[PDB]
Amino acid sequence: ELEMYKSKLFIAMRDESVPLPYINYEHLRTRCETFKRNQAECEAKVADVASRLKIKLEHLEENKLRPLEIPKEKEAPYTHKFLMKDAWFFAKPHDSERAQPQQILYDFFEAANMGFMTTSPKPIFGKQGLMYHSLWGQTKRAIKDKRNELEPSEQRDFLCGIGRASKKIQEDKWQESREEEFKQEETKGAAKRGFPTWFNEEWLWAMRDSKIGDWIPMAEMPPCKNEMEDYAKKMCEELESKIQGTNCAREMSKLIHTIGSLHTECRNFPGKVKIVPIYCRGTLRGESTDCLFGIAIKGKSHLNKDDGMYTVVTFEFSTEEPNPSKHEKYTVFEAGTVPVEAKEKKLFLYCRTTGMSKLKNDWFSKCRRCLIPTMETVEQIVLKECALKEENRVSEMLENKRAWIAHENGENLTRLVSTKLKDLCRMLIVTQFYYCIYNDNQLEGFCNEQKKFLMFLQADKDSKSAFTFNQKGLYEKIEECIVSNPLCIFLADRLNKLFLVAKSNGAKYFE
Amino acid sequence: MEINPYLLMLNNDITSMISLTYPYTGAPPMSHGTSTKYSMETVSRTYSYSRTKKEVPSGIFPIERRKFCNTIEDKENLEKPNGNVDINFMLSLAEMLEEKMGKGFFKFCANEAEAEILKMHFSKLTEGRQTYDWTSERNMPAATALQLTVDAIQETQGTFKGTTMVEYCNKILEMMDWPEVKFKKVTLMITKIGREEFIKRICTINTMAKDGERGKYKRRAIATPGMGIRPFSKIVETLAQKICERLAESGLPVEKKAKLKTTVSSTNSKLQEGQFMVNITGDNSKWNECQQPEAYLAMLAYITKDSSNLMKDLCSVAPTLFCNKYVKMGQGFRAKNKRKTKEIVIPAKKMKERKELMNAEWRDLFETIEPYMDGECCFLGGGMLMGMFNMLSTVFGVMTLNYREERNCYWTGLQSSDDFVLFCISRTWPEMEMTILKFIAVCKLMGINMSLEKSYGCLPELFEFTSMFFSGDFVSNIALELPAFTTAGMNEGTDFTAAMSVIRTNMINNGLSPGTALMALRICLQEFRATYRVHPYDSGVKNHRMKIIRKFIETIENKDGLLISDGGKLMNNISSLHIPEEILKEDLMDPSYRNRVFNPRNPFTQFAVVSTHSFRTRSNRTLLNTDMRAMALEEKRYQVVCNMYRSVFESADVNTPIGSMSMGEAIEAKILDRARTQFENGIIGGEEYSEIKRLIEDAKRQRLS
Amino acid sequence: SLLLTLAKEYANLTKDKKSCKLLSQGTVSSYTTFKKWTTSRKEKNPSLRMRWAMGSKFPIMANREILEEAGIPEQWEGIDLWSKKDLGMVLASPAAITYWNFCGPGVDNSSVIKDVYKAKFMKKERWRETLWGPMNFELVGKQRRVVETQPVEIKLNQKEIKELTMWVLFEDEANLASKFIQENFSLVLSLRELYKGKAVNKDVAAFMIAHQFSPEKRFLPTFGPIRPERMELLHCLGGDFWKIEAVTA
RNA sequence: AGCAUAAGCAGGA
RNA sequence: UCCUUGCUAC
C-alpha cells in the first residue's frame, strides 16, 4: 500500500530543485525532522527592523489630505451614444397591429413629415458634410419606398467601414524586401481631458419630472398575505410611482427599445445594412403613444467574438443651438422649423458616427436592473431607523426626514439643500444609471480608491485618530486613473467638494 | 445650484452608503489582442524580485536555474518588495505554531488527510474548471483533457487498470520514465514524442488574460495548469484544507463574522491599566510573485515528518513540479507598415528571430527575459501564479501572526488569501511604531510584502476584510453581481423558478431586504416575458403567440390558473420562493388545460421543476464545416456507447459505476446473468436462448478479432 | 423479449469497425469520463443565445410523427408552425407549443403527477395551512448552523439512500452485503410493495424516493428555534433588521 | 472616419 | 477567382 513509484527523472528532478544550502532531498528531509529553534531569530528580526527607515503618518498633526489633481486642459466632450438633454420627439397614437420597429419607422414617415426635412449641404460645423447629406437623402428615399436596406453607394461605403481593414498576413510567406516596407509596431495610450461644465445641468435635468407619464415597461404586483408583504408592496409602489415619471426613465426606455432592436437586427441580418428607428413608448393623457428620437443605421455586423465594434450611424433630432465644446464629436446640420405651442422654433438635425459591440448590447438592453440597487440603499436607511427605535415608523418617516444634497455654487460651506427622504430615490436612480453608461477602467479604479478616502472620512467623523503609511504613493495611484471619463472627473471634483464641506467640522483636511 | 451625491455620508455610516460606490450596474472591462506583454511583465517582474543572481546549471533542462531561497543580495531599498525566503526563520515559525495548540497537531491533520486520500476515486478530477490539453495544446474542460490523457496512456504502452488516485499518480511518474510517448494529431494521425520533450510538455502552464475583474485599471494574466499537476495539487489542498479547518485565525472555508467578534472581544478583555489597541487594515502586494514553492517544499517536509512513507513522498511532488514550470507566452505581436495598410503577424515561436521589430518597452521586458526563454515557453521557477495553492499561503499568514518575541505588547489578527487584519496591543505610540515595524520585519523576512499605499489603521473596530466594511457595531454586506439573477437560458420552464432560487439564496446568505426582493422578482419576470415573447392575456400585445391565446381564451374557465409561459399573471411572492409556479397553480387549472399541458405524448419533450415546456433549441451550423468536424462525430460515438451501458444496467445514473475490468465484458456477463435468472423462472425457449447465445458469441468473436 | 433486442443492439454496435477499439479497452469508471465530452468551452452567455434563438422563426427541434397526428401546418392567419428541413426531426416555432397547449389532445395523468411530486405538494400543503401575525422591527442575527431542512419521518444520511435505492429498484448489481440492510430490509419489503407496478421510469422513481427520505441539511444563518418545519420560514420569517413570527400551532 | 485603450475590431472562403 | 442568406412584435 505504502509504496510510491520511485521513478528516475523525478528523483533527479527533486534533487535539482532544493534550496541552496542543501545537496539532495535526503539531506533536507533529515534536517527538517530534527529541527529545534533558537534565539538568533530575534537578532535577525531586529537586524531587519534597523535597516528599514519607515515612519507612520498621523493626521491630527500633518493633515496633508490635499485635494485631488483634476487636469487643467481641454474640456471633456459629450460621449454618450444618444442625446439626453437636447432631444426632440415626434408623437403618434400607438397602433397595436403596426408594432414592429420598421412599421413604426414607416408610420412615422407619414406622421413626422420628412418632406419638409431638407438640409443644406453646408453644415454649421463638423467634419464631413456631403457624405452625411447624400446618406440622409439616400436613407430618406429608402424609407419613402417602404424598405429598409441601403443599396451600395459611395456614401455608405465610406461611412460604415467597408474594406477598411488591414491585411492579416501570417508568417509563412513574408517575402522580405531590401529597405522596402520597413515595418514595426508602436502604441500610444489615451489622451487627457478636463472638467466638464455641461454635466451638472444634465444631472439636474435627468431627475426632474417630465405631460407624458410611464416609460419603463414594468410588470404586475403579486397578491399579498397579512405578512411583511405589505411592506414590500408599499415600498415598490411608492418608489416606482416616483421614478416612472422622470427624464431618466425616458433614456432607459430609449436604450431598451433602440438597442434591443439593434440587437435582433445584428443577429438576423449580418452583411446587410439596416435602418432602425430611435423611439420610446409612453402614456400621453392615458392614450398610449410611441415617440421617435432619431434614425440609426447598422453597419454589417459579423459578430464573430464578444467584441466586434460595428459602426452605427445616428441621425438625431434637436431643437437647441449647438456648442463646439459640448457637441464636439457631432457633425451638426439643421432641419427646419417646428410649431411649438405654449411659437414656431427652429429644428436642428445632428449627425454622428459611432460604434457598438456585442457585450454592451447585452448590458445596455437590460438597464432596467438599475432599479435593483437603488431601493436597497433607500430601504437600508429606513430599516436602520426602526432598528434604532423598535416601532413601525415607515410611512411618516418617509415624510418627516431630510437628506442633504446639492450645495450651491458660489458658496459651499454649511449651505446645503435638504430634501424629503422619498424624493431621494430620484437622485439615486440617476447615479446608478450613470454607472451603466460611463463604465470604463478608470471608473473602476477610481471607485476602489474613493472607498479608501470614505474610510478616512468616517474615521474623522468619530475621532478615532487614523494614520497612513505612505501618502505620496497613494495619490500617485489615485491620480493615474483620472484621464478622460466624464463621470470620473465629475465625481473626483464632487469628492473634493465633500472635503471642503466636511472641513468645517472635523480636522483631517485642507482647503 | 451644484449637486453632490456624497453628502448623504455627512450624517450616515459606511455601512449604508457603501453600496452606492460600486459601479456594478455596467459592463466589466474585457481584454483585447495578445497577452504576451502581461506574461512578460509577470515573469520578468518575478526575476526582478528574486534579489539575487545566483544561477545554477541544469542537467535535465537546457536552461539555467536561478535560486530563490537563502541567497540574498541585500539592497538598501528594502521597502521595495523582496521575494527571497529564509527557511530557518520560517521553520522556527512553524515550530512556534505547533507549540501553541497541541503536540501531535500535524500528525493528526496529516492522518485525516491521508485517510481521505486513500478513499478517493480519480474521476473527481473531472469535477473541476478548465484545464490545458497538451495533446492539441489548447484549453478544454477537465473530462476531455483527462480522457485524452488516458487515451495517450492506452495508445502508448498497454492499457489502464487504475481507478484510484494513487495508481494514477504512479501511472504519471511511470510515464515520466518512458523513452517515447505517442498520441493522436489532426483525420486522426498517430504521432510520437521523445523523453525530454515530454518533460517539457508535461510541465507547461498556459497563460491568458483575466477577463471581467471588477476593480482594476490595468489587466492581469491568469494561468491554467495541465492535467499532470491537478491530482497532486488536489492532495496538497486536502492537507492544507484540514489544517485551515482546524485553526482559529483563518477565513477561507466559511463563518468569518463570529471569529472577528470573538477575537475583538477576547483581545479587548486582555488590556492592562494603560494599554490600548490599534487595528490596521492591510493588503499584501505582489502576492503571486513572492510565494516560492521551495519554502512550500521545506514546510511540507516539516508537517509530514511522522505520518507515513507514502504521504511523505506524495505531498512533496507538486512543489517540485512548481519549481520547474514553463509558461506559454500568449500568441506574439503584430507588425505593420508606415501607411497602416498591411499588418503581418509574428507568433511566439519566431519572436527571437524578429527581435528587432519591437518597441522600447517590449525590448526592455524581452531583454530582461531572453536567457530564460525556450522556443515557445519560458522557465519560471519561483512564482506561484493564479489558480494554484490558495489554502497554504493562508497558513503562511497565520504563521506570521503567531510570532512570539519573549512590556507586554503583541498582536493578533485574521488572515485570508492576501488580505489581513492586524490587531495590535501596546501602551504608547513609539512602542506602536516598534511593534508594527516588527510585524513588517517578520513578514518581510518570510516573504510577505505589506503594501504601504493601501493600508491604514484606527483605534476601535473600523476595519475592512474581504470587502465587508465593518464599522463600530454594524456590518455591511457584500455587493453581489447583478447578471447572476438571469443566467439560466435553456427553457420556458427552467427559468423563472431558477431565478426564484437565486433570489432565495441571495436572501438567506446576504441581506437582501424584502423590497429589493420584490423588485428583483418583478424585473426577472419582465426579462423572462421579453425573452420568450409571452405577455398576459389582458395586455394589448398582438404577436404570433398572443393571437392563439387571445383567440382561445374563452375555452379556459378559471383564468388565473394559466401558466406565466401561457399568458398568466403572477402568484409567487417572497413567501413562495420555494414553491414552483406549476405546482402552485395545479389546484386551479382547468382539467382540459391541465390534461393538455402535462401530456407526455408531446412532440417537443420526447424523442428541479415539472417537465412540460422543456424543449431543445436547434444546434449550430459551422460545427460540421471546419477542420474539427469529425471530433464532433467522435462525441456521437461516446454517446452511443454510453446509451448501450444505460441499456444494460437499468440503474446506473444513481450510483457511481466503479470497476476495473472492461465495459464490454460486464455487458455480456450481465446479459448471461439475467438470461439465466430470467431463464429458469421465466423465458424457457430454445430458439430465443440459443439465438441470444448465438448473437453474444458472434459479437464476442467479432470483438476479439 | 428485451434480451433479444439487447442482443441485436450489442451485435449492431460490435458490427462497427472503429467502435470496437472504444469498448473493452477502457474501464467501467471511464463511463463517467465518457459521459462528459462537452467540446464547447463554458456556454458563457446562455440568456444571450436564448434571446437570439427565440428571435428567429423556427428555433425548436420537434418530433414529426406525433405532431402530424394532430397538429395543423399553419394557423388561421399566416402563423407558421412547420418546416421541411433537417434523423427525422422537424424544426418548429413556439406558436406550435402554445397551439398544442390550447388546441391539442389530452391524457388524464393527475395521479402520477400528484404522486411524483409528493414533497413539493407537501410543501404547498404546509404553506397554505399556516397563520402569521405582526412584525417586530428589532435587531436580530445569529451564527451559521448545519440544520436539516425538510419535515421527513425517516432521516437517513445520504449513504443508506443510495444503497437503499440499489437494493430496491435493481438488485442484480447493487452492492456488497453490508450491516446497514437488515432492519431497513423490512422497509425494503414495503418498498417492493409500492414500486413494483408503476408506469414511472426507474430514474423518475429513484428521483422521487430520495425526496421523502432525505432531510436536506445545509449551513444557514438560523435564529430562534431550530424546528425543521420553519426552515423555508427562515427566509420567510426574518432578516437582519426585521422579524415576523406569530405562528400559533 | 469611428469604437476603443498599452491592442484589437472595422469579413471572409 | 467569388461575394450565399436568416424576416424583427416590451
Which residues, at least 6 apart from A45, have a Cβ–Cβ distance to it below 8 Å?
B405, B438, B441, B442, B445
For residues A23, A28, A30, A35, the Cα torsion angle rounded to the nearest 10 degrees is 130
Strand E within 7 A of A288 CB:
no
| Contacting residues of A for C45, CB less than 8 Å apart | 306, 362
Q: Within this chain, do residues C238 and C119 fall inside the same structural domain, yes or no?
A: yes
DSSP characters over B373-401? B-SSEEE--S---SSS--SSHHHHHHHHH
Q: Rounded to an integer, what is the distance from CA B415 to the centroid of its chain? A: 20
Q: B86: Cβ–Cβ under 8 A, 6 or more apart, which residues? A: A44, B69, B70, B445, B446
| Rounded Cα–Cα distance for residues A508 and A461 (Å) | 10
Residue A484 and residue B463 in contact, taking contact as beta carbons nearer than 8 Å: no
Contact B583, C114 (CB under 8 A): no
Strands B326-328 and B204-209 come out as: parallel
**C-alpha cell at position A299:** 453597419
C-alpha span between B544 and B705 (Å, rounded): 59
- B420's CB contacts (< 8 A; 6+ apart) are B282, B283, B284, B397, B401, B413, B414
Is the domain of A199 the same as that of A326? yes
Q: Based on the domain organization, do A202 and A120 belong to the same domain?
A: yes
Contacts of B337 (CB under 8 A, 6+ apart): A181, A182, A183
Find the nucleotide nearest A272 (Cα to C1′).
Answer: E5
Query: Where does B356-472 show beta strands of DSSP type E?
Result: 377-379, 410-415, 420-426, 456-458, 464-465, 468-469
Q: Indicate if CB(A307) is under 7 A from strand D.
A: yes
Q: How far is B401 from chain A (nearest CA, A)?
A: 14
DSSP classification of residue C168: T
CB contact under 8 A, A219 and B525: yes
Q: Are B37 and B219 in contact, with CB atoms under 8 Å apart?
A: no
Q: Is B641 on the interface with C (CB under 8 A)?
A: yes
Q: Least CB-CB distance to B4: which of A49, A56, A497?
A: A497
Breaks in chain C after residues, C-to-N cutoff 2.5 Å: 86
Mutate to test the interface with C, among A227, A256, A389 (most CBs of C within 10 A): A227
Return the C-alpha cell found at A390. Answer: 423598535
CA distance C124 to B584: 7
Reduced to 3 states (helix: H, G, I; strand: E, B; else coil), residue A496 is helix
* B562 residue type, one letter: L
Least Cα separation, residue A54 to chain B (angstroms): 8
Contact status of B645 with chain C (Cβ, < 8 Å):
yes
Residue spans per domain, chain B: 502-597, 629-704
A429 occurs within a structural domain: yes
CA distance A462 to A467: 14
Residue A366: all three cell numbers together: 437590460
Say if CB B655 and CB C14 are below 8 A apart. Answer: no
| SS3 call for B583 | helix
Cβ neighbours of residue A410 closer than 8 Å, sequence gap 6 or more = none
Chain B residues 107-136 within an 8 A CB cutoff of chain C = 121-123, 126, 130
Please report, in angstroms and rounded to a whole number, the separation of the first and last CA atoms in chain B: 90
Decide: B314 and B235 in contact? Cβ < 8 Å. yes
Residues C12 and C84 grouped into a single domain:
no
Are A469 and B58 an interchain contact pair (Cβ–Cβ within 8 Å)? no
What is the DSSP code (8-state) at residue B215? Answer: T
- What are the C-alpha distances in Å from B390 to residues B45, B81, B131, B287? 21, 20, 17, 11
Q: Which chain A residues touch B513 with a CB distance below 8 Å? A: 376, 379-380, 383
Asked if the Cβ–Cβ distance from B604 to C166 is below 8 Å, we say no
**DSSP conformational letter for B175:** H
Residue B223 β-bridge partners: B207
A489 touches strand E (CB under 7 A): no
Residue B413's SS3 state is strand
Is there a contact between C221 and B509 (Cβ–Cβ < 8 Å)? Answer: yes
Could you tell me if residue A475 is inside a domain?
Answer: yes
Cell reading at A265: 437586427
CA nearest neighbour of B90 among B303, B396, B318: B396
C1' (E6) to CA (B480) span, angstroms: 38
Protein A151 CA to nucleic acid D12 C1', in Å? 21
Strands A167-169 and B65-66: unpaired
Cβ atoms < 10 Å from Cβ of B610: 20
CB C117 within 8 A of CB B583: yes
Q: Which residues contact B203 (CB under 8 A, 6 or more apart)?
A: B226, B228, B229, B321, B324, B325, B326
| Shared-domain flag, residues C48 and C28 | no
Q: Which domain holds residue A27?
A: 8-34
What nine digits make up the cell of A253?
426606455
Q: Helices B429-446 and B87-98 meet at what angle, rounded to 10?
A: 110
Mark residues 415-454 of chain A whose C-beta is closer than 7 A to nucleic acid strand D.
440-441
Domain boundary residue, one of A364, A397, A416: A364
User: Which phi and psi (to 5°) does residue A479 adopt?
Assistant: -75, -5
Residue A459 phi, psi dihedral angles, 5° rounding: -70, -30
**Nucleotide D4: closest residue by CA–C1':** A309
Please compute, for residue B88, the number of CA atoms within 13 A of its CA located in the half-sphere on the CB side: 14
Residues 6+ apart with CB under 8 A from B608: none
Number of domains in chain C: 3
Q: Say whether both A490 and A394 belong to one domain.
A: yes
> Position of cell 478517493?
B120
Closest protein residue to D10 (Cα–C1'): A161
User: At a CB cut-off of 8 Å and minimum separation 6, what does B165 contact?
Assistant: B117, B120, B121, B122, B124, B231, B234, B235
- At B700, list the grid cell: 464476442
Q: Do A228 and C241 touch (CB under 8 A)?
A: no
One domain, residues C94 and C185 = no
Report whether A238 contacts A422 (CB < 8 A). Answer: yes
Residues 314-333 of A with CB under 7 A from strand D: 329
* Residue range(s) defining the domain that contains residue C31: 1-40
CA distance A406 to chain B (A): 4
Buried b (16+ CB within 10 A) or exposed e, B110-122: bbbbbeebeebeb
Distances, alpha carbon A271 to alpha carbons A159, A267, A300, in Å: 15, 11, 4
* Cα A231 to Cα A225: distance, rounded to the nearest angstrom: 11
Same domain, A436 and A303: no
> Which residue's C-alpha cell is 407537501?
C122
Residues of chain C positioned with their CB less than 8 A from the CB of A263: 51
Interchain pair C55, A391: CB under 8 A: no
> Residue B385 contacts by C-beta under 8 Å, 6 or more apart in sequence?
B42, B205, B207, B222, B223, B288
Rounded CA gap, A354 and A299, in Å? 10
Q: What cell numbers appear for C120 in the block?
A: 413539493
Looking at the fold, whether A346 and A383 belong to one and the same domain comes out as no
Flag if A20 and B54 touch (Cβ within 8 Å): yes
Q: Which parts of chain C fold into alpha helices (H)?
A: 2-14, 32-35, 46-54, 67-70, 94-102, 110-116, 118-128, 160-166, 182-191, 202-209, 233-237
Sequence-distant (6+) residues with CB within 8 A of C136 are A390, C242, C243, C244, C245
Q: Looking at the structure, tell me whether residues C14 and C99 fall in a common domain.
A: no
Q: Where are the alpha helices (DSSP H) in A438-470?
A: 441-461
The reported resolution of this PDB entry, expressed in Å, is 3.4
d(CA B334, C1' D11) / Å: 19
Output the nine-digit C-alpha cell for B451: 503594501
> C-alpha dihedral over A66, A67, A69, A72, to 10 degrees?
-130
Do residues B372 and B76 lie in contact, with contact meaning Cβ atoms separated by under 8 Å? Answer: no
Residues C162 and C65 in one domain: no
Residue with cell 481507478: B163
H helix or E strand, kind and range, residue B48: helix B36-48
Q: Residue A172: inside a domain, yes or no?
A: no
Q: Give the helix/strand (H/E) hosting A312.
A: strand A310-318
Residues A395 and A471 in one domain: yes
Calpha distance A254→C63 (Å, rounded):
41
Question: For chain A, what percentages of helix, strand and coil (3-state, to nearest 5) are there?
Answer: 40, 15, 50
Residues pairing with B204 in the sheet: B326
Domain edge (last residue) among C77, C93, C108: C108
Residues C171 and C68 in one domain: no
Nucleotides of D under 7 A from a protein CB: 1-12
DSSP letter at B466 equals T
**Sign of the Cα pseudo-torsion (B439, B442, B448, B453, in order):** positive
Among C59, C91, C108, residue at a domain's last position: C108
Half-sphere exposure of B459 (CA within 13 A, CB side): 12
Cβ within 7 Å of strand D: which of A 247-276? 271
Give dist(CA B549, CA C97) in Å, integer: 11
Q: How many angstroms separate the CA atoms of A483 and C179, rounded?
A: 72
A288 and A338 fall within a common domain: yes
Q: Residue B492's closest CA among C104, C87, C59, C68?
A: C59
Long-range contacts of A109-118 (CB under 8 A, 24+ apart): A109/A143, A109/A144, A111/A292, A112/A292, A114/A140, A114/A143, A114/A144, A116/A336, A117/A335, A117/A336, A117/A349, A118/A336
Residue A58: inside a domain: no
C30 with C46, same domain: the answer is no
Residue A51: all three cell numbers together: 535597516
CA atoms within 13 A on the CB side of B392: 27
For A100, B330, B376, the CA distances from B352, given in Å and listed in that order, are 57, 14, 10
Q: Which of residues 9-68 of C touch B (CB under 8 A)?
A: 9-11, 13-15, 19-20, 22-39, 41-42, 46-51, 53-54, 58-64, 66-67
Chains touching B (at least 3 CB pairs under 8 A) are A, C
Do A266 and A118 share a domain, yes or no? yes
Q: Is residue A482 part of a domain?
A: yes
CB of A148 within 7 Å of some strand E atom: yes
Q: Which residues contact C231 (CB under 8 A, 6 or more apart)?
A: C147, C149, C150, C220
Kind and range of the H or E run holding A360: helix A358-364
Residue B182 C-alpha cell reads as: 505517442
Percent helix, strand, coil in chain B, to 5, is 40, 10, 45
For residue B678, the one-letter residue type is: Q
- B122's torsion region: left (phi>0), alpha (psi -120 to 50) or beta? alpha
C1' (D2) to CA (A486) span, angstroms: 19
Best CA proximity match to C239, nearest among C139, C145, C143, C149 = C139
Chain breaks in chain B (C to N over 2.5 A) after: 186, 254, 406, 607
Question: Inter-chain contact B302–A187, Cβ cutoff 8 Å?
Answer: no
As a whole number of angstroms, the distance between CA A492 and CA A66 comes to: 13
**What spatial distance separates the first Cα and last Cα of chain C, rounded to whole Å?**
56
Quickly count: other Cβ atoms within 10 Å of residue A6's Cβ: 11
Alpha-carbon gap, residue B478 to B523, rounded angstroms? 21
Instruction: Give the phi and the psi of residue B457 in degrees, each rounded to 5.
Output: -155, 165
C-alpha closest to that of B584 among B599, B569, B604: B569
**Which residues sit opposite C156 in a β-bridge?**
none
Q: Are residues C77 and C173 in the same domain?
A: no
- B-C interface: how many C-beta pairs under 8 angstroms? 327
- Closest to B376 measured CA to CA, from B556, B618, B253, B205: B205
Chain A nearest-CA distance from C83, in A, is: 18
Please report, for residues A130, B123, B126, B149, the alpha-carbon distance to residue B144 in angstroms, rounded to integers and kept in the order given. 57, 12, 8, 9
Can you list the pairs that B232-235 forms with residues at least 24 positions away whose Cβ atoms lie under 8 Å? Answer: B232/B169, B232/B314, B232/B317, B232/B318, B232/B321, B233/B318, B233/B388, B233/B389, B234/B124, B234/B125, B234/B165, B235/B113, B235/B117, B235/B165, B235/B314, B235/B315, B235/B318
Which chain A residues have a beta carbon less than 8 Å from that of C242? Answer: 228, 383, 386-387
- Sort out which chain C residues have CB atoms less than 8 A from A387's CB and list them: 137-139, 241-242
Rounded Cα gap, residues A301 and A299, in angstroms = 6
Distance of CA A451 to the CA centre of its chain: 19
Cβ contact A215:A252 at 8 Å: yes
Q: Which one, of C239, C228, C146, lies nearest residue B509 by Cα?
A: C239
Does C104 lie in the same domain as C94?
yes
Q: Which residues contact C230 (CB under 8 A, 6 or more apart)?
A: C237, C247
Rounded to the nearest 5 percent, the helix, strand and coil shares of chain C are: 40, 10, 50
With CA atoms as reference, report the closest residue to C53 among B565, B492, B598.
B492
Q: Quick check: A268 CB within 7 A of strand E? A: yes
Q: Torsions phi, psi of A322, nearest 5?
A: -75, -175
Q: How far is CA A113 from CA A86, A289, A316, in A?
A: 20, 17, 15
Q: CB-side exposure of B639: number of CA atoms within 13 Å?
A: 8
Distance CA(B62)–CA(B53), nearest Å, equals: 18
Q: Which three cell numbers stand for residue B681?
A: 423462472
A317 to each of A92, A101, A335, how far by Cα in Å? 16, 18, 8
Q: How many domains does chain A have?
A: 3
Q: List b or e across B434-462, with b for residues whose CB sees 16 or more CB atoms inside 10 angstroms.
A: ebbbbbbbbbbbbbbbbbbbbbbbbebbb
Residue A294: what are its φ and ψ, rounded to 5°? 180, -170
CA distance B9 to A108: 48
Based on the fold, state whether residues A343 and A406 are members of the same structural domain. no
Q: Do C46 and B666 touch (CB under 8 A)?
A: no
Q: CA A204, CA B4: separation in Å to the nearest integer?
A: 11
DSSP B207: E
- Are both C122 and C196 inside the same structural domain? yes
Q: Tell me the C-alpha distance between B191 and B135, whole Å.
A: 10
Same domain (yes/no): C121, C244? yes
β-pair partners for B224: B206
In this complex, the residue of C45, C48, C138 whose CB is nearest that of residue A390 is C138
Q: Are strands B221-224 and A402-405 parallel, antiparallel or unpaired?
A: unpaired
CA pair distance B13, B164, nearest whole angstrom? 55
Tell me how crowded residue C197 is: count the other CB atoms within 10 A of its CB: 6
Tell me the nt nearest to A191, Cα to C1'.
D5
Q: Is A189 on the interface with B (CB under 8 A)?
A: no
Residues 177-206 of A, Cβ under 7 A from nucleic strand D: 187-191
Q: In angstroms, rounded to a whole number, what is the distance separating the alpha carbons of residues C220 and B40?
A: 45
